[PDB]
Design a protein around this ligand. Structure first.
Ligand SMILES: [Mg+2]
Ligand SMILES: [Zn+2]
Lengths: 48, 346, 98, 168, 96, 49, 282
DNA sequence: TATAATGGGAGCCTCTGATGCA
DNA sequence: TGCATCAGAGCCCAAAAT
């Protein structure tokens, strides 16, 4: 929803943002026809 | 150490103008231009040439150079002559020189005081293929255009007029410089329209549009073929230094063969063809081998007309065609027997 | 005709054919880049009396060391239902060799 | 003759211009429609040579009978296309520019010669500070401006354009 | 690479091996006729199919690239003879 | 994470579109260009390490 | 801070002119200036102002540095530095040594120090920075072309800003941008942020990068090369071999020795000639 | 070609050598 | 004059890279 804080006018709409890749049943992706895996990354935990 | 930060700091050293200060500089600039017109009339001298001499003396000795349109080379000798000619004017005429000088001075100041305006407009155009400083400099160019065209009488503040010209300058720069393969500004406009259109269609259709759907949305004159051709023309090159792999070890260009330079096999083959051709031409008479060499360009590289080969051997244009035909006839006969030249026909 | 034996009407190798290195998988012609034939070719063409063709053989062949039985072919042209290729591409052929 | 030695030396602007077969006056590369090189651009055949052997761009002179000829119409020499690997162009700068190797390689060669530190050479080259060639009798803060002195922007303007202030 | 119909890389360490063996002509072949010497590699192929022995190699094209790349860096690289006179490895093509 | 990045770029475009054009007639469809988001996700899946 | 010099009649100087104490201002020489300064001719107040200031020559950038380098007398500087080599302090002698070594370098070589500043910038031949159509009809091009393009654009703009009498702030910005652009072409990342193509974090590849490093011209193409008449395969033990032998697969051997094989196939009658022989092995 | 608009944005090893401070 | 601090210099090969 777009709002004009001065006027109060409100126009609301559902906008299309493109596509997001879906994971298949086995935990992989199909990207341009080829099956891909996203490998987990170990790193330093945030904190003090 | 940071060129943007430095420029911003330099920008911050010229105070912004009061409405009064702005009108004063704008007023002096307009008046200075009217003065240059008058000096042209009085002297019968080029107004542009006059403007460069006036401008040369205001900016100082630092900047003195030839201007592409001026007929005379602009150097201290010539600018002294013309400046001395202007100072040789009567008082009521010589006053316009003083007016013009102060006009150029005010032009400088007016430009300098508005530089932060260009920055605030340019920052919005980043990411379109021009660097921030580049956008600032083209934007500055528009600011200069605005100062020359500004009419202070209209009572509009300067920022209003400048903003149009600055936006214009930045957009022209992006249209002119952003592509390795340069595209005419109008064609860039057409390409961008097609982008917006396709984006509208994808925003209403929930998927990328086909070529035909884009063609409807573009109206008459547009079919699917033209949408495709326009997109083809709009393709930007990709770097030869584009990485292959997750190591830094290889480039995309390393995988691209060279089709221009002949391969060893091709060079060898062409050489063998020349040697077999000479072998077949030795089985003719020297004259009928020479007629063919002269007619097909093997000698000197050019193909001679029958009139030229005939005049060179002392025979008639019909005669040289005849000795050429019997040469070629003998050539065809020897080939069917020995089959030497067949394999080079691929 | 020995070279073209296993190609169908459209130029794609037939399903079930055995392909070996050097064999044509998909036949293709490309228009010759404009060039002036060397005087050797001028003389050769003149000797044999055969026009140099406008097109060259760009056909896809089995690379060295590869080959097998053709189990599938996919052909996608431009202007046929459901398929749109990247700009400039008239048609795409895929040959699956097992 | 046989190559026994390889010399490497600095190149004068004159020598760089003698190498050059033309000045590249335009950022253009190749024409978006014809795909032929753009005149005066980075790929120009009039500068770096013909794309095709013994054939000019427009195609008036197509064979080796002309070698060394420069087509009046298209401006291209008829020679081997191999020359596009060899022939150099040049860009004529509006302001001299320092060659960074002689700046950033420590100790700087330019800096060492002129007795300028790394910071000073940086400040002049990248336009943070002025350097005085001719004081022309200037004096700043009671002491005379000495040649090769570095001035800030504030210092230079007060010297060059004078000091003033405006009070609201 | 195999997919490009590529040649094997005879790298820095392979060159050391040929050097330690003192195989100067084998090494020179690797550096010229079997690689970027254009005139040389053409001549070698033609010689072998004709039964002649392979000709003396010429300047490797990547050395010409190096010279021109250093000229692009404003350094003048000059090949000299024993008399310290210039030798033109571009064979007149790049000089006016 | 890459989604968040593409979203930040899309937001830059929104603020930039909220200055230009008519300050009166604007919808969300006119304000949003989704290309930055699509690109961030497309970049992650194809070219990420 | 300026001096005011009123005038009744015509003024012989004009606004913007630079002036020294004593320079004639107006009235045929009657009124003249007491200070060093810049002339401001006031037509309202009927007065010639002279703002106290000097004609000082002070410059920025490579133009200034090139000048100081042009004015170097290296012979003279050698003499001074030899005298410095006698000074008791080790550091004094050390600094004079390093300086003197650069001086002597230029002296023996015959190189002028000002050549380290560029006026004409060389442009590499196009085939070494190609624009090529790849397989799909798409174009692929070397990064140097974008680096040259940045350079050319800024230079041309500099010529235009100069012709139009832009303020010093604008001309200065362009000049520092011009220095930075030459820097990027020659060694990118060397000074400042590496210039990159849009929508990529990848530094463009400059001449220094092409020359140096593991991927550079020296180590990649000069001290090692890919070669013809070569092959590779998996190895397997051959106990039956004599020490001077190896097993070589015939299909490999046919390729490795292919030209020789073409010649031999001609001597024996297997093919009419080399061209036919090659076509038969294909 | 004219309401006015006036200062940006991202950020995370070892050895060697010169340089700037006790 | 003697000592930190920092900038800039390096960090295996070939194969492959779908
Ligand atoms: Mg490797
Ligand atoms: Zn021509």
């Amino acid at each position: 929803q777009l709002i004009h804080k001065d006027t109060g006018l409100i126009k609301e709409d559902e906008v299309f943002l493109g596509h997001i890749p879906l994971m298949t049943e086995d935990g992989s992706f199909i990207i341009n026809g080829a099956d891909r895996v996203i490998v987990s990354q170990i790193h330093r935990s945030p904190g003090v | 150490s940071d060129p943007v930060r430095q420029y911003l700091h330099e920008i911050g050293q010229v105070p912004l103008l009061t409405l009064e200060e702005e009108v004063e500089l704008a007023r002096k600039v307009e008046e200075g231009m009217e003065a240059i017109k008058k000096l042209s009339e009085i002297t019968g001298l080029d107004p542009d040439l006059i403007r460069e001499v006036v401008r040369a003396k205001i900016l100082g000795s630092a900047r003195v150079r030839h201007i592409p349109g001026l007929k005379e080379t602009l150097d201290p000798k010539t600018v002294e002559e013309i400046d001395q000619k202007l100072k040789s004017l009567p008082k009521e005429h010589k006053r316009y020189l003083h007016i013009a000088r102060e006009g150029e001075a005010a032009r400088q100041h007016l430009i300098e005081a508005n530089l932060r305006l260009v920055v605030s407009i340019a920052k919005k155009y980043t990411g379109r293929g021009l660097s921030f400083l580049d956008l600032i400099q083209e934007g500055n160019q528009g600011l200069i255009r605005a100062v020359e065209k500004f009419e202070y009488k209209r009572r509009f503040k300067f920022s209003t007029y400048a903003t149009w010209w600055i936006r214009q300058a930045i957009n022209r720069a992006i249209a002119d410089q952003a592509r390795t393969i340069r595209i005419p500004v109008h064609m860039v406009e057409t390409i961008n329209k097609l982008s917006r259109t396709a984006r509208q269609l994808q925003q209403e259709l929930g998927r990328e549009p086909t070529y035909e759907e884009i063609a409807e949305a573009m109206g008459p004159g547009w079919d699917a073929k033209r949408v495709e051709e326009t997109l083809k023309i709009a393709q930007e090159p990709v770097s030869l230094e584009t990485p292959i792999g997750d190591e830094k070890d290889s480039f995309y260009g390393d995988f691209i063969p060279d089709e221009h330079l002949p391969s060893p096999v091709d060079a060898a083959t062409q050489s063998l063809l020349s040697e077999e051709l000479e072998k077949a031409l030795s089985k003719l008479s020297e004259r009928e081998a020479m007629v063919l060499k002269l007619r097909k360009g093997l000698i000197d590289g050019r193909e001679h007309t029958l009139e030229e080969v005939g005049a060179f051997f002392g025979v008639t244009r019909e005669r040289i065609r005849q000795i050429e035909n019997k040469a070629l006839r003998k050539l065809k006969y020897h080939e069917s027997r020995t089959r030497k030249l067949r394999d080079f026909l691929d | 005709e020995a070279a073209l034996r296993d190609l169908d009407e459209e130029g794609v190798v037939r399903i079930g054919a055995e392909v070996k290195p050097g064999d044509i998988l998909v036949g293709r012609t490309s228009f010759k880049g404009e060039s002036e034939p060397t005087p050797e070719e001028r003389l050769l063409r003149s000797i044999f009396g055969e026009k140099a063709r406008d097109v060259k053989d760009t056909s896809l062949r089995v690379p060295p060391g590869e080959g097998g039985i053709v189990v599938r072919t996919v052909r996608l042209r431009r202007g046929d239902p459901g398929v749109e290729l990247k700009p400039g591409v008239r048609e795409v052929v895929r040959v699956y060799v097992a | 003759k046989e190559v026994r030695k390889v010399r490497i030396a600095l190149a004068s602007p004159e020598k760089i211009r003698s190498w050059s077969y033309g000045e590249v006056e335009k950022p253009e590369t190749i024409n978006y429609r014809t795909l032929k090189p753009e005149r005066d651009g980075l790929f120009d055949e009039r500068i770096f040579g013909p794309i095709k052997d013994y054939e000019c761009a427009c195609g008036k002179y197509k064979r080796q009978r002309f070698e060394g000829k420069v087509c009046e119409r298209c401006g291209v020499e008829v020679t081997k296309s191999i020359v596009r690997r060899y022939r150099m162009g040049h860009i004529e700068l509006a302001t001299p520019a320092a060659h960074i190797w002689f700046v950033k390689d420590v100790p700087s060669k330019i800096g060492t010669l002129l007795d300028l530190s790394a910071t000073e050479l940086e400040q002049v080259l990248y336009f943070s500070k002025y350097i005085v060639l001719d004081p022309k009798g200037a004096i700043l803060n009671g002491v005379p401006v000495e040649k090769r002195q570095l001035l800030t922007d504030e210092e230079y303007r007060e010297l060059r354009y004078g000091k003033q202030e405006t009070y609201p | 690479g195999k997919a490009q119909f590529g040649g094997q890389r005879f790298g820095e360490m392979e060159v050391w091996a040929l050097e330690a063996y003192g195989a100067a002509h084998t090494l020179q072949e690797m550096l010229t006729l079997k690689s970027d010497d254009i005139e040389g590699r053409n001549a070698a192929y033609e010689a072998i199919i004709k039964g002649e022995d392979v000709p003396e190699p010429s300047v490797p094209e990547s050395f010409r690239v190096l010279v021109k790349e250093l000229q692009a860096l404003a350094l003048d690289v000059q090949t000299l003879d024993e008399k310290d006179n210039p030798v033109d490895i571009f064979e007149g093509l790049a000089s006016k | 994470d890459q989604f968040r990045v593409g979203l930040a770029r899309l937001a830059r475009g929104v603020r930039e579109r909220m200055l230009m054009g008519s300050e009166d007639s604007l919808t969300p469809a006119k304000l949003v260009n989704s290309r930055p988001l699509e690109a961030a996700i497309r970049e992650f899946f194809s070219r990420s390490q | 801070k300026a001096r005011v010099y009123p005038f009744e009649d015509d003024v012989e100087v004009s606004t913007g002119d630079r002036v020294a104490p004593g320079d004639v201002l107006a009235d045929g020489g009657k009124v003249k200036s007491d200070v060093y300064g810049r002339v401001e001719v006031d037509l309202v107040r009927n007065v010639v102002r002279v703002v106290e200031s000097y004609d000082i020559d002070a410059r920025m950038g490579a133009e200034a540095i090139q000048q100081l380098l042009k004015e170097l007398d290296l012979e003279a500087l050698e003499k001074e530095l030899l005298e410095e080599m006698k000074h008791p302090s080790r550091a004094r002698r050390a600094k004079a040594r390093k300086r003197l070594e650069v001086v002597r370098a230029f002296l023996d070589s015959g190189n002028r120090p000002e050549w380290m500043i560029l006026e004409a910038v060389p442009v590499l031949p196009p085939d070494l920075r190609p624009m090529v159509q790849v397989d799909g009809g798409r174009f692929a091009t070397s990064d140097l072309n974008d680096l040259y393009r940045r350079l050319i654009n800024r230079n041309n703009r500099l010529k235009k800003l100069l012709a139009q009498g832009a303020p010093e702030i604008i001309i200065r910005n362009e000049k520092r941008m011009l220095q930075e652009a030459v820097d990027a072409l020659l060694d990118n990342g060397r000074r400042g942020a590496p210039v990159t193509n849009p929508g990529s974090d990848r530094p463009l590849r400059s001449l220094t990068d092409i020359l140096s490093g593991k991927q550079g011209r020296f180590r990649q193409n000069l001290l090692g090369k890919r070669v013809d008449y070569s092959g590779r395969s998996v190895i397997v033990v051959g106990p039956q071999l004599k020490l001077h032998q190896c097993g070589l697969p015939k299909r490999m051997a046919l390729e490795l020795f292919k030209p020789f094989l073409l010649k031999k196939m001609e001597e024996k009658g297997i093919a009419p000639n080399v061209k036919a022989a090659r076509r038969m092995l294909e």
